[PDB]
């Protein structure tokens, strides 16, 4: 799969693994 931080909720087919942070905002880590 392909894991990486995104600005909001992920696809179905992608897994959340964490909190990602970016620009001092918090990310959500979706793999696919």
Known sequence: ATCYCRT???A???SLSGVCEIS???YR????
């Open 24 to 26: 001092g905002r918090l």
């Open 12 to 14: 179905t087919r992608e």
């Open 8 to 10: 909001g909720r992920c």
């Open 29 to 32: 880590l979706c793999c696919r």
